[PDB]
Amino acid sequence: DDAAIQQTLAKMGIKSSDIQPAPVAGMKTVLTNSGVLYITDDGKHIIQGPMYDVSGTAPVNVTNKMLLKQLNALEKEMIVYKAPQEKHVITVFTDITCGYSHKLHEQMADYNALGITVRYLAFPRQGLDSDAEKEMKAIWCAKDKNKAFDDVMAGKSVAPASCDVDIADHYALGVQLGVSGTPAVVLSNGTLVPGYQPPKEMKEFLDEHQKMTSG
Amino acid sequence: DDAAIQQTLAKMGIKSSDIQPAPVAGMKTVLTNSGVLYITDDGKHIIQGPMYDVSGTAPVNVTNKMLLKQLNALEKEMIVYKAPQEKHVITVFTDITCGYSHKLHEQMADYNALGITVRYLAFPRQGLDSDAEKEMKAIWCAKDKNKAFDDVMAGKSVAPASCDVDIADHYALGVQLGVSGTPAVVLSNGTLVPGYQPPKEMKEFLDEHQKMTSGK
């Protein structure tokens, strides 16, 4: 029961963020300061994720699917480049100091034109004590985030700006989702697709992924 | 049901090596080329792991246990150089083409004199089919494995063989244990200590480690 899980977590000096159900009988999904963990109902066993549902045609990352709750929770903190005819919606962990992230951003109008809406979350590859984290902190805190992001990528004046957006939250989520390098795309089902793909290749990928997921 | 589990693994291009009931009801501990995975009896869900038994004072790594199980099965294939008076027993992943493995073997008398029993398993850094793997296969397939390893490390040839020994097994397990180079030392509890240490340093290290693990 919950008391057992809490006693086990407390023993390990872990602070439970919330106890959710798991697709496996006998255990729960637990998001903690240490991240997501699976723990048996009796609190006797812990299994580090991720957990995958492999009953279907393709493997689904259930941990990531669950984390989409935390991801969608950051929706207002995302820098969104809306496609006029939104046919696809992807969330991309980006680093303004990454050459490939610049290459992707430079073609944003093409992704948008192909019907792909891009939502950015910050991911400083160099960690929280880096120029990347400071620069993106200022971007996300700007009156106009899109303008600020476009400017910084173009190598312009990154106006000093502060707010309560914590890049550490974006970074932690990305790490938990399995983000290693940038850019990294997160799909609507939680699937992580690390890497850069030009507008055309990307569109086809998104079209095929979708076709081979719903049936 | 191992059956449904193997169908799931196959559809993922993953191969199983050993399947055992897990400490968690409705789950099994599966050793695969992708590491130790925890899969449900119906083969529908896979959890990466490791799994830890936290129903005690300190966490117990179930994955480490599964790996030690494989190591125990390999004891019958280890080349053992026993110390007259056995104070320590270490398992060493060695490569006959490795300069530090040459040195370690050349100092075997000293490790043994210092009470250290050394048990070898093969680990071709250059992978399977390499010249290293081929020669060790010949060594491990010989009547007297000790004499054959000695002869080879001495530059002499050994009566080749086609036995039941497959170096791929040692290699695969080494990889699963975290071995990346040679020589690599594996302690009784599964702790991997990569690298060469001369006899005296190795002895001090093992004594200190044993003291620390026993709280003395």
CA distance B59 to B54: 5
Which amino acid appears at position B131 of this protein?
Answer: D
Using the Cα atoms of residue A88, residue A93, residue A95 and residue A99 in order, give the sign of their dihedral: negative
Contacting residues of A for B55, CB less than 8 Å apart: 8, 42-45
Alpha-carbon gap: B4 to the closest alpha carbon of chain A (Å): 10
Residues of A in contact with B52 (CB under 8 A): 45-47
Rounded CA gap, A18 and A41, in Å?
14
Rounded distance between C-alpha atoms, residue A102 and residue B206, angstroms: 52
The H or E element that residue B152 is part of is helix B145-153
For chain A, give me the number of helices (H) and strands (E)?
Answer: 8, 11
Domain A78-215: assigned CATH number: 3.40.30.10
A116 by DSSP, 3-state: which? strand
CB atoms within 10 A of CB B27: 23
Q: What tokens were used for A62?
A: 């259930």
List the single residue in A42, A47, A62 with the smallest CB-CB distance to B38. A47
Of B44, B55, B59, the CB nearest to A54: B44
Cβ-Cβ pairs closer than 8 A, A with B, add up to: 77
Q: How far apart are CA B54 and CA B48, in angstroms?
A: 17
Q: Please list, residue by residue across B47-66, b when 16 or more beta carbons sit within 10 angstroms of its beta carbon and e when fewer do.
A: bbbbbbbbbeeeeebbbbbb
Token pair belonging to B42: 């119906």
Closest B-chain CA to A22:
B45
One-letter amino acid for residue A43 of the chain: G
Q: Which part of chain B has CATH 3.40.30.10?
A: 78-216
Residue A41, phi then psi, degrees to nearest 5: -60, -30
Q: How far apart are CA B216 and CA B200, in angstroms?
A: 20
Spatial CB neighbours of B199, under 8 Å, sequence gap ≥ 6: B107, B110, B111, B113, B114, B116
Comma-separated ranges of CATH 3.10.450.70 domains in chain B: 1-61
Amino acid at B107: Q
**Inter-chain CB proximity B48 and A43 less than 8 Å:** no
Q: Strand, coil or helix: what is A18? A: strand
Contacts of B25 in chain A (CB under 8 A): 26
B25: Cβ contacts below 8 Å, ≥ 6 apart: A26
Please identify, in words, the CATH class of the domain defined by A1-61: alpha beta
Edge-first strand order for the sheet with A45-48 is A16-21, A27-32, A35-40, A45-48, B51-53, B60-61
* Element holding B161 (H helix, E strand): none
Outline which parts of chain A fall under CATH 3.40.30.10. Answer: 78-215
Contact A119, A91 (CB under 8 A): yes
In Å, how far are A19, A21, A57, A114, A207 from A189, measured between CA atoms? 21, 18, 14, 21, 14
Q: Using an 8 Å Cβ cutoff, are B70 and B173 in contact?
A: yes
Q: What is the resolution of this structure in A?
A: 1.9
| Residue A113, C-beta contacts closer than 8 angstroms, at least 6 positions apart | A83, A84, A199
Q: In Å, how far is A101's CA from the nearest CA of chain B?
A: 30
Experimental method: X-ray
Tell me the CATH number of domain B78-216, given options 3.50.50.60, 3.40.50.300, 3.40.30.10, 3.40.50.10490: 3.40.30.10
